[PDB]
Symmetry: C2
Subunit: 114 residues, 2 copies
Amino acid sequence: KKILIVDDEKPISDIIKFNMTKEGYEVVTAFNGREALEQFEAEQPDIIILDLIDGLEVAKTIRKTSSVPILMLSAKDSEFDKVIGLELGADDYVTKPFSNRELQARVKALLRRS
Amino acid sequence: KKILIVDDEKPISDIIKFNMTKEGYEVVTAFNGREALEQFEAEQPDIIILDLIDGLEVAKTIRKTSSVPILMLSAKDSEFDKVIGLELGADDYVTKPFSNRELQARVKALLRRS
């Protein structure tokens, strides 16, 4: 399975890439909205981890063409934030800082379900 | 032409209904998200004035089936607010308090354009 990680901070991208690789996924990365949409089109990931082009707008664009699972990750943890991510098409929304095991379990649940 | 005004505050609804009637539109009203979606389906308005079911979610639902012009109105005036209204499908976004003539001019521009 192939995961696209969309994160503008290289430290957190590396941690998630490390942990997903350790589980046996193939990982592609993108560091802005433009690279995210290019990578999504060119790589056809099975799942996108897509921090908050602007994260809400990426997920909006993707859902125009694709039902690929999207897991949003964000330091923003208010009800407004979670609800709007989910309404714009996220399948799940996880806050930073996150537990590495929990993120892995949530990626697996999403993959199982699609 | 028929305008659907979606406003949960009866005082402001009445002012907008008054002014739109004075110009010769037929006005239907709705006071929550559920009534908005029912009225949109049953009345097929030519334009919706749709204050911020939750305004962003209404406009999202509408755009699933329809390209009817939507003018969002809101006391929230930050960049985030305007941008997200527009990205979720609004054609225009006007802040409260508004000028009655300006709202009329913006409804006309929208109608002209669709």
